[PDB]
Design a protein around this ligand. Sequence first.
Ligand code: ATP
Ligand code: ATP
Ligand code: ATP
Ligand code: ATP
Ligand code: MG
Ligand code: MG
Ligand code: MG
Ligand code: MG
Lengths: 252, 48, 245, 54, 210, 385, 96, 319, 302
Amino acid sequence: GYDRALSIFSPDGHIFQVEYALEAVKRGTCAVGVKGKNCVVLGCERRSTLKLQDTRITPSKVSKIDSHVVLSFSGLNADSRILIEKARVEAQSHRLTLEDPVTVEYLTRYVAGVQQRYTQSGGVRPFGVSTLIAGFDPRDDEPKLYQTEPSGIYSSWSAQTIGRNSKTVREFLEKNYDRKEPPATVEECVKLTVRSLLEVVQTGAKNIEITVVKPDSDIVALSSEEINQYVTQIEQEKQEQQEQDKKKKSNH
Amino acid sequence: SEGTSADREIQRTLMELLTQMDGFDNLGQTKIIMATNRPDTLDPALLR
Amino acid sequence: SEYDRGVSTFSPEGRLFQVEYSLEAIKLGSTAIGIATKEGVVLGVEKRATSPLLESDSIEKIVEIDRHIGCAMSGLTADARSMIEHARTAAVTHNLYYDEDINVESLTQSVCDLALRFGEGASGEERLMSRPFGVALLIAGHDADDGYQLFHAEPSGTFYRYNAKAIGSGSEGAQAELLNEWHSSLTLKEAELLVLKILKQVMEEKLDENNAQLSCITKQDGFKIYDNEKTAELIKELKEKEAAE
Amino acid sequence: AAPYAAKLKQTENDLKDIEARIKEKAGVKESDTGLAPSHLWDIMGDRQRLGEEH
Amino acid sequence: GTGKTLLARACAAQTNATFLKLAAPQLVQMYIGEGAKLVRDAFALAKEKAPTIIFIDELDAIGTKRFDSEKSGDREVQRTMLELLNQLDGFSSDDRVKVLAATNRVDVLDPALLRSGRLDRKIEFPLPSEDSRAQILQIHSRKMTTDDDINWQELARSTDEFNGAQLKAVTVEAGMIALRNGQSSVKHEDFVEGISEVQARKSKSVSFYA
Amino acid sequence: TRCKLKLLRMERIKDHLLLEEEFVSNSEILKPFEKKQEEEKKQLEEIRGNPLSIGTLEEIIDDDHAIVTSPTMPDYYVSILSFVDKELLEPGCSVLLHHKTMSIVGVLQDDADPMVSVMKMDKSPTESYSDIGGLESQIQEIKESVELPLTHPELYEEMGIKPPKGVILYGAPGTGKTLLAKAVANQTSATFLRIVGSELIQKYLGDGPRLCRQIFKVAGENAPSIVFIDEIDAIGTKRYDSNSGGEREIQRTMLELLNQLDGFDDRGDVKVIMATNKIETLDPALIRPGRIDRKILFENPDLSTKKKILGIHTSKMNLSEDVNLETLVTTKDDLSGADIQAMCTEAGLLALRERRMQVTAEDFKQAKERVMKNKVEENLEGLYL
Amino acid sequence: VNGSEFVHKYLGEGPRMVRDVFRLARENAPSIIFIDEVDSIATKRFDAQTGSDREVQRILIELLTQMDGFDQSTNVKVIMATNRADTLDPALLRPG
Amino acid sequence: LKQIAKFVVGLGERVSPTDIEEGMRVGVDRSKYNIELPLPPRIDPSVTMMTVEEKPDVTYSDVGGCKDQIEKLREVVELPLLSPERFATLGIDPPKGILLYGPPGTGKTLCARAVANRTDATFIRVIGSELVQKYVGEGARMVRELFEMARTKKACIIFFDEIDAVGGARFDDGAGGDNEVQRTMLELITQLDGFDPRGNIKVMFATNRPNTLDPALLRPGRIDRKVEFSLPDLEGRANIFRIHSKSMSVERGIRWELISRLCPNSTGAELRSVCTEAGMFAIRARRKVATEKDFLKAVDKVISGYKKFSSTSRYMQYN
Amino acid sequence: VKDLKASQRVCLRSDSYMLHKVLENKADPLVSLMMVEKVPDSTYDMVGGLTKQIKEIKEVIELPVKHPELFESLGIAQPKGVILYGPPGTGKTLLARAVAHHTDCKFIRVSGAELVQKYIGEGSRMVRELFVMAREHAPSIIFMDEIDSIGSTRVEGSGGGDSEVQRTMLELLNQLDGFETSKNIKIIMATNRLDILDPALLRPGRIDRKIEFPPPSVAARAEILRIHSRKMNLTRGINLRKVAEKMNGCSGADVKGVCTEAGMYALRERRIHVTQEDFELAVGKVMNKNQETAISVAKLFK
Ligand SMILES: Nc1ncnc2c1ncn2[C@@H]1O[C@H](COP(=O)(O)OP(=O)(O)OP(=O)(O)O)[C@@H](O)[C@H]1O
Ligand SMILES: Nc1ncnc2c1ncn2[C@@H]1O[C@H](COP(=O)(O)OP(=O)(O)OP(=O)(O)O)[C@@H](O)[C@H]1O
Ligand SMILES: Nc1ncnc2c1ncn2[C@@H]1O[C@H](COP(=O)(O)OP(=O)(O)OP(=O)(O)O)[C@@H](O)[C@H]1O
Ligand SMILES: Nc1ncnc2c1ncn2[C@@H]1O[C@H](COP(=O)(O)OP(=O)(O)OP(=O)(O)O)[C@@H](O)[C@H]1O
Ligand SMILES: [Mg+2]
Ligand SMILES: [Mg+2]
Ligand SMILES: [Mg+2]
Ligand SMILES: [Mg+2]
């Protein structure tokens, strides 16, 4: 049995195609979401092969679904393309009908619905892709981050890690982050995302990509200069940290 | 190469049989007739 | 065994195996309890925090279907998305056609008719769902000519009326207690604290308001989903009640 | 590796000395099976054993 | 469980004859070169004081088709089995000495024993028919308590691919459930519950409509 | 030099001393007795005649006689004679027989077989942690199951629960699960059998399951013991095609192995270590528990683990002067412990070849690329990208 | 010898037969070893995972190592013939 | 002789013609061939003293639960031996055999040990690979001799544990004496058959697969009654944790009810392993009791390990 | 009895079975196996043309036996067993043969299967007997052929009667790695591919050194022609380097195949010299073979 289609329920009550989709997520690139209280930072790992691959004509892992909603992804690179396109045509159809900017909540349900559609029928597999969808609501400054899974279950998470070796980032993120007091300033928010991706990239600040989404439909993608500037400060404080345990131990 | 090994054991006996009737040629006075009773085996007799 | 892969497709006992297997999906899910009382039906649920980064009160396990029909859910929330939508449409078109608040009994049947599509082609209703659903509901409301009813929708398309019914992991244990704890003479404050007494015992973590979410159907208040401040107050009163004893 | 290599060479000599105990130890033994009070039965047993009915 | 053993024993009662029974693991005893004396000894007795039936049961290891499974003494046992058949052919009309044979699978049975008119007439006992099932339950029931509210036709329809062996167990089972409850008189209800405890299925498990 | 000398001084003097005293005393045993212990020796030598045959004791017969089975085909009717009493003998025990007229001498074989010599290990492994490079949690679990109940029963008393009856080790190839088992075997100070699981399998009717049964027989008597049976995918349930001899054999060995391990009151204090490499051929009635009472997954090293394996190995290699350890472990991804063991031996080798009396940076980096070739998968970024 | 006569009568019987045949050639050396059919014995590849298929392979592994020699035999090395040219190619034998 | 050469042998020195007859062991000279002294009857007590054993200390209350299956298993074996009165008056002769099947780790072994203790009659432990003791046809005389010894006693249980060897299945492709493998299987089944009606020679079989079982053997009236055993339902689980935890130190005002909701369907054996493992966590913590928390961990480890072999993953890793 | 040890063969006298003498000779089919094959007289010089292959096998196998000192100080542990791999026909058996001459240790070749011994029955647990007999006669340089060119699928198995030969394969590995004493046991393997290999023969501690023996270069091939001609009669006008460029072989044995064919022409005519023209005709015979194998990949492909 029982993983040979999506239409067998199995006596352990799992639809295998969804369970196996999750293991495909691992193949893609780390992606990390962290909300502040005036920003959401959405950052992802950028894979670098060789110098003969570009990063100009070559697609980033952060994609604009509109002008106030953003998306980063993990999964098969092929799968993700259609997932993003269909989500985008919905985002525009929403202004066509209502004439409103899309609601963050409305959008995430639409993308989870598409994966859910695929998952229910047996004529297709689902998109083997989990995404994190960041954005701000049409007029409120309340920061929103939601997550989707191949299953077509969405949740809201204040911070979440997906992609390659997600769990080891999750535990660090769980500790440092508070929902009692998220970062007040975009600058510390950005650096926390950097701290999370530091672990899994090892060398490079050209393997960390930062984009910020803020209210009033501002999305900006940050420069290699600024990211290198953030990673060096982390690198200096970390160097210092090692020295302090060495002193403190002698001192007591 | 996936048939029974039983038939393979008893194969050898016939190979001594087949070679033996040769001594009679080309005196045609003594002759040999053979009758099969299985389509399961294919005898090295049909071959030579 | 060797008779179980298809949904058509029997089975020396005579049962559809695919249909029975979806029963087992409901136990995977988080515990949900409902208790009908003559003052309203209380739908409490459990939520489970995998990380204390999953924002508890943005996951929805109680949802509004109309102003008088509510649902709680357990099982796959992938299957609950289509399941719920159907019923939200049912209540809204019924009000459109007849102006009357949908009857709870008929609202169940609409859910369960949709549950029935298994095949990929049949005579009669034309089947277009590729598998049985993987979600149960507790359906709660109040109609005007039969009072408060509490139903359980099954993904197998059968409906049992109940006085009280639990689904989820803690279904067996809750069900055992509620056999000793239902009465004709219970009241809605009493129901509310009844759900929490049963709930703490069948939750793996501990009873907090973050991991609880109760709600009521009262004719006066309509469908009211609570807050955590409200839910916390009730928790503090459960603990007082158990202290005396 | 002279400072410590010297001491290594002596360790192999020790291995042979322990081996020589295994041989030595076997050279004298003392054993006995049965119990001491069954000594009278041995005496009987020679008369039956010698004899032929078995 | 088609009732071969039964029918051969009975066959012998009718004709009032000298009945010798042999069974392929019984026949072989001690050193396997002493196995050949025993076949011969048996048939020496039989032909004298005729009529007779020599019935050889379950032949699945001294009448193997393969010659790969090693045997050197149990081979001589097959050969001395063969003399007997030969002397039936040796009488022309072999009225005096009748032989019967039984085996569980005839695919396992040796091909040279069937080959030619060395042994004649091969008789296949199928699964009981609906007709045959009705009769088989009744007879066994006689021995326990018997009630006529039991409709035996109802039972015969329900069972599919059942042997007489399997039905004796249903008759006995009907008695086990009945005693358990403490009803000193069997019902039809008990009997219907006896099909699904002899079979490995559970029909006792509530469903989504039960 | 001073540290070696200090150990060397004590162990040579005493051991050399114990040797010399055995020489003097051995003579000296003999003189006290000459008719006070001598008598039993004279009576045995005469009755035995020196040549003797074995028999197996079939049964006793009441009148001081017995019936025995010889290794030759006839049985014989013996009389019970000599010092050895018939409360020291029961059926199922081996007996010696006298040449001329077969007679019960006594027992001295004590059901010996040449397979007992094979079970019985005499070789002692290295091996303790601090030669085990990481896997802290994995070290811990095998110590609590196998080392601990024997050394400290106190904790098991206090709680009042039975001790683990085994453990099963499984994971990726070459992970060095073998060190941990060896480490358990050294530290305990317990009788360590084993065996390979490919040694119970033969081709001779019914000898195989009796060899399985024999291991437990020797362990239960010399309990507490630990038994390590390697490679259980040589004794799984797997297909066997047709026209094979081994199709029965594999079935019977496994069956006997199963009953003894569970017990019917069990040995009750013999723990087992099973190791294996294919869990898709393992039978289902040997990894359900009461048999084994943990099951543990081993996985290939990661950064912290690698640095430890590496860490021990480099300190036993001279002059790593310009060698940074951290920079190598960083780049390395998804390797076994086998591969890092190999990289130290290879890197030293390149240092020899360079005509250099010391290791370098560049000696290590070259060796590292070589062993990455060997263990590689690329369909992760092949599929993705 | 024949290829109908190089078969497995038992599991692992196939390779036993080869070793006897090439020892015997050495005993009576010089001698010419003739195999009539090596068209069933030699086949480039399989999509199989049974030891039934491995019996056929081990004849060829054995055939190769034995031909070769280590005694540097006074034999006139294996003469073989095949009706086909496309299952016994000069990439299974080869080149000399 | 036990040389298997045959002789006409002279007289003894006190032998009677009324003592030495067919089926009696006698001793003769080893080179002269004359009886002088006769020998005792039989020659099977060598194998039969070890196979029989006295009573283990397990009770039919652990055997876990209080299942319908346990009750019915007691009816087939124990009740008629104890009392045939009910059976004769109902008008049934008791089922002769009974099959113990179910996934391995269901505790058919708990059943074998328990029925021995209750019975107050002789219980023979027999392993299927202690009947294979071949020297070529010797293994068959083991089956025969052992069966015959039970049939001399009247009210007795023979129990075979995990037959699949001797009670195997048939081949048409076998090798090396796979006929003698069949001969030993078939030897058992015929003697069974033959004695019927026996009363009170009762056969139990534990099989880990009922399809590695001869189709001739499986045929009812060797094996008239068959009981299926299963993974205990939630209640049966709850009961069994309390037996084992009575023995351990635990928290007064703990929830065993909670541990069963958490645990999914699983082998009864592995249900026993929970309590042991929970205890392990209390042991390394140095705590002198076992919390509710550490049982939660103990289920989690066993289940999560087991999932590794069969069916992975959940959707409640984010949900 | 001190001059005796358990599992030491001992000779006996008459029918008393009084001990006579001690047998330090132990007669086994393991031994007869090696006895037909003898000590080989292939030398390194004949595999001359590639000396890199000869240089890595020397360092790993020979050098730690003769001088353990270096690797007990500078490195850690005796360098592990090698597996020879490369395209078919390169010279991988030839290399093993050559090494055997130069080391002067006891080899325990051991041909292409081990199921070739059925004098004590089939090796199911007598495979392990090999290690014991080797350990005594130490150094234990072992050579094994499991060429494994056939069966593109064979690694996914876990097995039918694959199991018998796998049980033989497996028990080798356990014994090798051992428990834990060693007497410098080294296993040279020769094999066709490592992609087409016996499952779990390499994993990867065993055997984690690897030696590649590549397809020869023209610079390599010229030397191979040179040495085969020194035994024979040289080319006239010394064009033996000149022909190397015209066709490159694809193996070391293809280089050999030119010379044998070339000197065959001299056999037809019965001349005492060879010439350039003989060498040229000879290359073309070797190419016929590359053509016979693949020809349909140029016509009726994709
Ligand atoms: N056709 C039948 N009519 C009456 N009873 C039957 C019949 N078939 C089977 N039985 C009952 O089942 C019991 C067991 O079947 P039985 O031993 O006769 O099988 P068989 O076909 O002769 O066996 P084998 O193939 O093992 O030699 C019989 O003793 C009888 O009580
Ligand atoms: N943690 C470690 N510390 C030191 N050496 C290591 C470590 N891990 C691996 N090794 C080295 O690599 C070898 C690889 O393990 P090995 O080949 O014995 O396999 P295994 O998976 O334990 O085998 P099997 O399934 O046959 O029991 C070890 O024996 C040791 O030499
Ligand atoms: N129902 C139960 N209650 C209590 N403990 C149990 C129960 N079932 C199993 N166990 C425990 O698990 C151990 C192992 O299971 P056991 O050996 O009894 O199984 P089985 O089904 O007879 O297996 P096999 O197929 O290997 O013969 C028992 O000794 C006992 O400790
Ligand atoms: N590199 C070489 N230098 C010189 N002669 C060579 C060289 N390689 C091979 N030879 C010669 O060519 C002969 C044939 O080698 P062949 O190609 O058949 O070898 P192999 O690699 O051992 O094969 P297999 O994989 O079939 O076991 C050798 O026996 C030797 O005489
Ligand atoms: Mg019959
Ligand atoms: Mg190991
Ligand atoms: Mg059992
Ligand atoms: Mg070769």
